């Protein structure tokens, strides 16, 4: 089997991407944030604290003839930006782009943090990291991909995120028309439950390539590119007026600047992030100070190849017995 679904930026900055997901019988369609950095599929629901719901579409298990309470199961998750959610669990039929999993754990939110309440466009998250990170207790649950894997034509999914435009998540096949050149594959460590890999280096603009190992995660659920302070400083040093602002919470730059590209290495291959991808616009409405899309990972504890990086590539998440990651230009 295979599945194919369009993923759409939630706003003009590509702060996140939402993909329609069918849950239950009859189908209830919710727009979920596919997150290769976590492993829980959770939704706004009829059980979510009313004051914490603000425009989202909710899942109502009682209206689904295939929903079953997973008795005794609870979940609770916190993300790298400090947001969180928690609740109980149902199993139900979940379909993405034509690919159907029966008995998928659908984690129903009883509580969500303010950042989720404020994102009216995000009805929940669909985790695509390794199932070892799933937070359901006392019986850990599998991701949608993990449940689908054996039925897929090939045990893979691909992320093809657009810049200021829709893109595609495919399950079970590689669309050879969706990228240019070849896909370069690179080793993955699953030891921390992430799609963790080591980039071979970077370049800033037309600068020479610096060969250096950068361990980080491929995370569709993180907006920006978080890299070591040395790398990030080298990038922003090429932008007149750019500075790290503790009050704003990262590097800012004059909105009048033309940003240089940033290249990252995948083995001997190179992915180029155009400068425009690194512009996250005014820090506040009307400001001439703009927020940068490359930020330091110091104090996160891990480097994160988020959407800024991933949207510059066609990315293969290969869930074979020994997982790997593939990157192609597009």
From Swiss-Prot:
Boundaries of every Peptidase A1 domain copy: 17-328
Active-site residues, Swiss-Prot/TrEMBL: 35, 199
Disulfide bridge map: 255-290
Catalytic activity field: Hydrolysis of proteins with specificity similar to that of pepsin A, prefers hydrophobic residues at P1 and P1', but does not cleave 14-Ala-|-Leu-15 in the B chain of insulin or Z-Glu-Tyr. Clots milk
EC number: 3.4.23.22
Keyword Hydrolase part of the UniProt annotation: yes
Molecular function GO labels: aspartic-type endopeptidase activity
Keywords of the record: Aspartyl protease, Disulfide bond, Hydrolase, Protease, Signal, Zymogen
GO biological process, one term: proteolysis
Coiled-coil segments: none
Similarity comment text for this entry: Belongs to the peptidase A1 family.
Record's protein name: Endothiapepsin
UniProt organism field: Cryphonectria parasitica (Chestnut blight fungus)
Gene that this polypeptide is encoded by: EAPA
Full protein segment contained here: 90 to 419 of 419
